[PDB]
Design a protein around this ligand. Structure first.
Ligand SMILES: Cc1ncc(C[n+]2csc(CCOP(=O)(O)OP(=O)(O)O)c2C)c(N)n1
Ligand SMILES: Cc1ncc(C[n+]2csc(CCOP(=O)(O)OP(=O)(O)O)c2C)c(N)n1
Ligand code: SF4
Ligand code: SF4
Ligand code: SF4
Ligand SMILES: [Ca+2]
Ligand SMILES: [Ca+2]
Lengths: 1231, 235, 118, 59, 117, 58
């Protein structure tokens, strides 16, 4: 039977799916990625489904592939599932039609997520389910973690019996990711509800060569329409079947459901129709308001498709006088959203009462649907009756939003503690929170709920948690506003963020901070806070967790201490049980490396409880008063949009703050200066050999090489030390390494690679640096970058360029950013970047912060993320546009030469025409022309004057990682590359799907441990390089920064210049590869990757074939046995060793054998006399000819597919034989 | 001006599309295959569009690839088109959201065709247009070969001015493939209806390294909902 | 029970042969990405591609399998790019049986490939 | 001949194209069973996914 | 399994309208391309030749190992293996670790071995 | 006494214009849809027209 469990909606549903499934074809997509991974770990742990078998999970190349795999399985008799969201779901639409079309019991669990329109979103809403509204799948929505378990069960059983597939969805993140104490079911119970007669029939109806049948047939108009209506009886029965099962499950659970369910007053006059998690919060308000005499209600929709009107009505009170239908989506241009549209058709089709239906929209993209907003939905029903409104936003442009009053009271049940925790990434706060929930929920019989707000910044990002405990079930599917206990685990927050917003009177508040004395405390906390702490009469507790942690031996790790404060001061448990329960867990978890650790944790709990006393404060706080703004210049935009968002006030921005098409300006990153590195490399002038490897290596542009001639260094700081410039060309200048100690992640990469024995760069805590190195940076910042002094694309000269991509919200020591920065240090001013989704787009474009910037001249990388599946074909689009627009310019210029245009004008014009595709001459000439046609506005000459942003050749880049290039986007990568046109694709190889969870990609190595490769991948790496090298006309090269920066630059220069396609795959490090010694060891690692033979560097350049030379060049030397010492250094490879030695020793040998073979094959290619020649292109010329001209026999068929406008002329359909057979025949009758 | 012509709905519309387009990313799917092929033979015969240039047609690996190519082109400043039907259309749905999402003057001509459920069908119906009902594209239907020419014209001009993409559809085979005596228009006349201030703006709003901007951004819950409603005035 | 269960799974007793049929337009173009994945999956399936060197069924449109200089739709002046080498392309995996055939040339070799591939 | 060798026990996941058009245009279906009632289990998923479809059956 | 090319090429191409139309209508371009195709098949077959004769080559195992056992790439790792992003958040995630903001191991130590107190 | 409203611009669906084409004497009106959405309570065109009629309130 039943089992208590405290988890999220995802695992709540993956519980049921694993039980009811025999096969799962899968693909990772946030927020639904978990489900598939758990389905997989469980299977890997021998877990049995209801038939006593472990699940067959396989990972596809995309979710369309997964959709098709799911289709073939069902067809073939197995019961199947899949987990998906937003775009993933859209890709499964074509199959879904086939799947329900052929009446198969498929079941899709989707964590309803928003669709990428003006912007992308991982958050929750119904834009994707509503997109599959017509595929024929049944839809059943759960509105709470408990409901995800049940509803998933209902969906499986009903599918088996009805033969109509089911899509079970719950809101993304707000349910998928909400921990909550629920009651699950044993597989045996699920097994017991299965219609066996139906299941045994699914088996016989299936494909099998023993008793075959053909499905999928192409039908004409005579029978299509009929065969389409032939499934009606089924859709007629799918509702009762759902009702039957909601009933059976309720029989075992006690939790009862209806197709549509009413909640609220029997004589409510104002009813609301909602679907998804809004219902919980709406219900919660309903209670509050109703206790006060209000006649309000709610119909929570369960079974959205089929839409049984009969049941709709059976849930709507007869007194409903006004009813508003809430939709979590926006169909641009429809006369209303889906739910609203459906309800209406019921009301008209009913032909009686007509309550005045109002339509409203909420929660798009995980926007909050708090109580105040519901109060607002309601107040509207009785007041203004604004139709087609929005709630949650201030719509000042169209004016469709409802006003919201936050003074609205708290509506959580009586006896409910609400908590919030503010922490830094990787301080264990969230972990501790999830722990305190298992602990409380498992040793008390209170309901526990937990929701965690995160950060888009990968390193040092903030994180706020919302926990809730109470004697009553928690229906609050919204963030906590009236906090009982607010805790702040990173002292830096106090100053910057609104930590105490909404805290209840006398609400305890703990702060991790060393300001133990009223003195220091007074010299840090802002006015607003002291005051807040005061008038609200808070119980302020300050605790120096860092020190107590260091003291008790836990090396300054505050988690267990700040965990103590919760248990002790939180108010959820009585002191003795709290501190009891906590210790019991210290042993269960832990009990790892013996007692020492354990005890050292216990002691932390002790002193934590001991040092945890009320900070007593002066009444003065009641009117502590205001501070001064040591604020820098920041833009008109940073000031107005990017700062407000970064300080957690983006909800406050009305719609007028944003651009209709959702664009964003570059360089907003410049003004961020997060300053979160612990240690920042500090310069040592007397050791610097002046080389520029440090900046060239900094994955965030934290190091800035200054070369300034002496009179620029005048008002320079006392301490702005600079050496004399080594170099011929470099003589009148002084060179200095400027550390931006506020845009550093303290990864340690630069110092680690810094060449001299007596290092030039040394790691020092940020506070020993910042005071002195801040002003210096600024100074060094408003000094000219010497772009022309040294060869642009020379390691040293490259670091003397404007880096057009700085301070990305990417991990410290990320392996992607060093590459892409220098790519812009070489082509920045004229490049198009079509970025495939992944860390590239996440670090490269997470609103509001944008790394990429323009140069001194206002030009920089035109950046845009289309989707994940199509980065290349997107960048091929731009390429085509440039052709046409640039061709127009050339026919126009070619025409101007035939005019009475100036001689100079004509001289620029043919020079340009002659150098159109030269990124030097095209600009040299376009500029002469830009000045020459200045002002020109009439005819031809004016036209050309206006096409000035087309004069200089642009560089079209396609950015993406291994998951895109090798998997989902390969097919396209391949096509664009085969197209032979001039685009440049740069693949950052992390050897796994990073951005989403380190899922194994087709690029992942033999034996590497990733998701869905949990026992170490048991297949070789996909050889993309050798794969595209077969074309012969595509420049292909591989690189590794740590090994050769010279060779990287030689590839950038060569790839971009080959008049045609270029593939560039670079070894990129990642938190996911798990570098044992740190990401500072990253460069050293890329470098070992090439030495070991693991990653050889080569180049295949067809222009060499053009000159009769072999285009294949190896650049790395043979393997040097480093292999194992290389693999055993990454956790990805070492975990398998720890946990599967017998299997692991085998695979690292496989990988050591593979790199040995590939490199021996890389050897005689370099030496091959045989090879594929080259021509850029050159011929065609005006002329079209159909393959059908002057053909003797028919070249087309009687099929309607081949019929063309000018087709129909007679010919020999080959029914009478071969020519010679026709003739030997004529020459055999003649007469 | 006007010109009598006796042809089908397909070429009736491919007439207008070639005239109003600078780029076409393409893929063959019955019954709409013709359009793309004519767009291509014509281009191969030096035929000029309203800007006096021949069309840039390229064939993709699938129509999703074509959808994405159509997206990158528009983003990059060129006016673009594509021809598609049933499944081809379904594959263009993800992009279509991005295309209208970013307010680009795309135009999709679809010979409305049935979707493959219990069986496949090359024949005509609105199962595929209705599938793209929510992508944000404007939809304009023509109900006769004469109407395919006009309505295709309307769809192009209106797109240029409104910045809301357009999907112009006509029934597959019953219009796409019906020969009928119609009156067409000269490119010069089509050219004469174009809002130039709007067209010159499409050009400036576009991607270009000379004056860059970032599009496609990932947004959280604080600003997604708003930025989504920001396009209302347009619709 | 048990014995009865097994008695009912009689359409599963003998090993079945899973074939994937399609021409050049599917294998080289639209369906390649998938063809590649399934093939890289290393599981036991058999793909048979009928190469017509163009998209036949719909109008003889040029495919990525169409040869240098062959006249098809969108290759109206004869394709100006080489044939996509799918065979050498998938032969890079190392664990995928790859063969090409031609009936008119050797029917013996065709049968030797059918027997070996399956 | 592919069926003359494996017919009795094969699954066919046919990508769209002439294969499916000639192999499955209702009402006429070429593929037949043998003297024993067994033959190729035939099915066209779509055009874009023949392989991943036949991988489904395999699973 | 096939033998080297035997100059049939052109008499082969010129036999299919697909190739012959281009000739009729674009001789200057067509004579060029049938030479391209005649050169290509000549190269590919010469490459097909020393593959047959290669001592170097990619070995084989049908499969055979695994056996019950699951392990996350994150076990016993020293530094953080996941980020603060909502995309990486998992059910059992949230335990503290080194987010690499403080440098390399040896940089952390040379530092500890430089203040100690 | 029969009529027909041919729809041109299906999206956006301007109700205002819908009505400006429907005679005031229409006593019964059937919306023809060239599609089948299995399980919906009606097809798109029909669904749209309805919302106009209710939203009109007369
Ligand atoms: C169509 C689609 N399916 C799934 C996803 C989820 N997603 C985005 S990031 C990711 C993987 C990223 O891959 P990779 O190229 O390896 O990126 P990186 O390692 O550089 O982060 C996926 C599957 C998506 N965005 N779109
Ligand atoms: C998603 C999708 N896009 C387009 C089509 C139109 N269509 C079917 S047949 C055809 C080409 C057939 O290709 P190929 O594999 O060469 O087939 P064969 O030469 O054997 O006829 C296409 C594009 C389709 N069925 N599905
Ligand atoms: S530690 Fe890392 S982020 Fe900091 S300056 Fe060095 S390379 Fe840059
Ligand atoms: S790596 Fe070291 S020696 Fe080289 S420029 Fe940087 S600080 Fe100087
Ligand atoms: S590629 Fe890896 S190291 Fe870089 S941002 Fe992504 S998760 Fe971080
Ligand atoms: Ca290039
Ligand atoms: Ca096989």
């Amino acid at each position: 039977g039943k089992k208590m469990m405290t988890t999220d909606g995802n695992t709540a549903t993956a519980h049921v799916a694993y039980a009811m499934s025999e096969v799962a074809a899968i693909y990772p997509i946030t927020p639904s990625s978990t489900m598939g991974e758990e389905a997989d770990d469980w299977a890997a742990q021998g877990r049995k489904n209801i038939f006593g078998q472990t699940l067959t999970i396989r990972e596809m190349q995309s979710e369309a592939g997964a959709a098709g795999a799911v289709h073939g399985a069902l067809a073939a008799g197995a019961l199947t599932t899949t987990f998906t969201a937003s775009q993933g779901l859209l890709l499964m639409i074509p199959n879904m039609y086939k799947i329900s079309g052929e009446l198969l019991p498929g079941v899709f669990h989707v964590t309803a997520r928003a669709i990428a329109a003006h912007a992308l979103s991982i958050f929750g809403d119904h834009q994707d389910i509503y997109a599959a509204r017509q595929t024929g799948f049944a839809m059943l929505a759960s509105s709470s973690v408990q409901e995800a378990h049940d509803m998933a069960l209902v969906a499986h059983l009903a599918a088996i019996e009805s033969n109509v597939p089911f899509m079970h969805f719950f809101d993304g993140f707000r349910t998928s990711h909400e921990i909550q104490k629920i009651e699950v079911l044993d597989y045996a119970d699920m097994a017991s509800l299965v219609n066996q007669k139906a299941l045994a029939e699914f088996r016989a109806k299936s494909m099998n060569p023993e008793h075959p049948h053909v499905r999928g047939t192409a039908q004409n108009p005579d029978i299509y329409f009929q065969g389409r209506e032939a499934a009606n009886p089924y859709y007629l029965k799918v509702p009762g079947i759902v009702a039957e099962y909601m009933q059976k499950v309720a029989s075992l659970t006690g939790r009862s459901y209806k197709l549509f369910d009413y909640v609220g007053a029997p004589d409510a006059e104002r009813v609301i129709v909602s679907m998804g998690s809004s219902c919980e919060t709406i219900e919660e308000v309903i209670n509050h308001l109703a206790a006060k005499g209000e006649k309000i209600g709610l119909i929570k929709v369960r079974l959205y498709r089929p839409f049984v009107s009969e049941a709709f009505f059976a849930a709507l009170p007869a007194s409903a006088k006004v009813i508003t239908v809430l939709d979590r989506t926006k169909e641009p241009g429809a006369p209303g959203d889906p739910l609203y549209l459906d309800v209406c058709s019921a009301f008209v089709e009913r032909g009686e009462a007509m309550p005045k239906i109002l339509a409203g929209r909420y929660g798009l993209g995980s926007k909050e649907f708090s109580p105040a907003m519901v109060k607002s939905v309601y107040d509207n029903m009785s007041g203004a009756k604004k139709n087609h409104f929005t709630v949650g936003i201030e719509d000042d442009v169209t004016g469709t939003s409802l006003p919201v009053d936050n003074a609205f009271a708290d509506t959580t049940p009586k006896g409910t503690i609400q908590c919030q925790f503010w922490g830094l990434g990787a301080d264990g706060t969230v972990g501790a929170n999830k722990q305190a929930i298992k602990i409380i929920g498992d040793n008390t019989d209170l309901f526990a709920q937990g929701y965690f707000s995160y950060d888009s910044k990968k390193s040092g990002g903030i994180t706020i948690s919302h926990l809730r405990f109470g004697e009553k079930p928690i229906q609050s599917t919204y963030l906590v506003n009236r906090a009982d206990y607010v805790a702040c685990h990173n002292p830096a927050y106090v100053g910057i963020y609104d930590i105490l917003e909404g805290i209840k009177d006398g609400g305890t508040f703990v702060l991790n901070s060393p300001w133990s004395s009223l003195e220091d405390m007074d010299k840090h906390l802002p006015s607003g806070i002291k005051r807040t702490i005061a008038n609200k009469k808070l119980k302020f507790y300050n605790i120096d967790a860092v020190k107590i942690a260091t003291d008790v031996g836990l090396g300054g790790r505050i988690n267990m201490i700040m965990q103590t404060a919760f248990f002790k001061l939180a108010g959820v448990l009585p002191f003795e049980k709290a501190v009891d329960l906590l210790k019991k867990s210290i042993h269960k978890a832990y009990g790892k490396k013996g007692e020492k650790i354990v005890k050292m944790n216990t002691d932390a709990v002790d002193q934590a409880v001991t040092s945890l006393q009320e900070f007593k404060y002066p009444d003065s706080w009641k009117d502590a008063p205001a501070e001064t703004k040591a604020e820098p210049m920041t833009n008109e935009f940073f000031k107005n949009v990017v700062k407000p968002i970064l300080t957690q006030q983006g909800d406050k921005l009305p719609v007028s703050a944003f651009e209709a098409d959702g664009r964003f300006p570059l360089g907003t990153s410049q003004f961020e200066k997060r300053g979160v590195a612990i240690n920042v490399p500090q310069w040592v002038p007397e050791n610097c050999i002046q080389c520029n490897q440090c900046a060239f290596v900094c994955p965030h542009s934290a190091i800035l090489p200054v070369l300034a001639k002496e009179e620029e260094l005048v008002g320079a700081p006392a301490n702005f030390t600079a050496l004399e410039a080594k170099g011929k060309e470099l003589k009148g200048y002084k060179f200095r390494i400027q550390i931006n100690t506020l845009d550093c992640m303290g990864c340690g990469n630069c110092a680690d690679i810094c060449p001299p024995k007596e290092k030039a760069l040394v790691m020092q805590p940020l506070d020993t640096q910042r005071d002195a190195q801040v002003p210096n940076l600024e100074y060094a910042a408003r000094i000219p970058v010497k772009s022309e002094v040294l060869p642009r694309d020379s390691l040293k000269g490259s670091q003397f360029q404007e880096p057009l991509m700085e301070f990305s919200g990417a991990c410290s020591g990320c392996g992607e950013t060093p590459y892409v920065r220098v790519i812009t240090q070489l082509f920045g001013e004229r490049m198009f970047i079509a970025n495939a989704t992944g860390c590239s787009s996440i670090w490269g474009a997470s609103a509001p912060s944008m790394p990429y910037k323009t140069n001194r001249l206002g030009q920089g990388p035109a950046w845009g993320n289309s989707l994940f599946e199509d980065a290349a074909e997107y960048g091929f689009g731009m390429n085509m546009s440039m052709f046409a627009r640039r061709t127009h310019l050339a026919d126009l210029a070619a025409k101007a030469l035939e005019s009475d245009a100036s001689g100079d004008v004509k001289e620029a014009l043919q020079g340009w025409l002659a150098g159109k595709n030269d990124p030097i001459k095209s600009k040299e000439y376009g500029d002469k022309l830009k000045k020459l046609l200045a002002g020109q506005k009439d005819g031809l000459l004016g036209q050309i004057a206006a096409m000035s942003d087309l004069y200089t050749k642009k560089s079209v880049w396609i950015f993406g990682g291994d998951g895109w290039a090798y998997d989902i986007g390969y097919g396209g990568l391949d096509h664009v590359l085969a197209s032979g046109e001039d685009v440049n694709v740069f693949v950052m190889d992390t050897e796994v799907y990073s951005n989403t969870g380190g899922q194994s990609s087709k690029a992942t190595p033999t034996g590497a441990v990733a998701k869905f490769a949990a026992a170490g991948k048991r297949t070789g790496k996909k050889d993309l390089a050798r794969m595209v090298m077969t074309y012969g006309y595509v420049y292909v090269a591989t690189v590794s920064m740590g090994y050769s920066k010279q060779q990287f630059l030689k590839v950038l220069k060569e790839a971009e210049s080959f008049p045609g396609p270029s593939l560039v795959i670079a070894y990129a490090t990642c938190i996911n590869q798990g570098l044992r010694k740190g990401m500072g060891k990253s460069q050293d690692v890329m470098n070992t990757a090439v030495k070991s033979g693991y990653w050889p560097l080569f180049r295949y350049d067809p222009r060499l074939a053009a000159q009769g030379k072999n285009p294949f060049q190896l650049d790395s030397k043979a393997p040097d046995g480093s292999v194992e010492e290389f693999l055993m250094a990454q956790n990805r490879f070492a975990v398998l060793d720890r946990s599967f030695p017998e299997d692991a020793k085998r695979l690292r040998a496989q990988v050591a054998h593979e790199l040995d073979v590939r490199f021996k094959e890389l050897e005689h290619m370099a030496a091959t006399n045989i090879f594929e020649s080259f021509a850029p292109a050159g011929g065609k010329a005006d002329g079209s000819v159909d393959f059908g001209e002057g053909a003797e026999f028919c070249t087309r068929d009687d099929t309607p597919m081949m019929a063309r406008p000018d087709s129909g002329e007679a010919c020999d359909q080959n029914r009478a034989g071969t020519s010679e057979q026709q003739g030997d025949l004529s020459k055999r009758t003649k007469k």
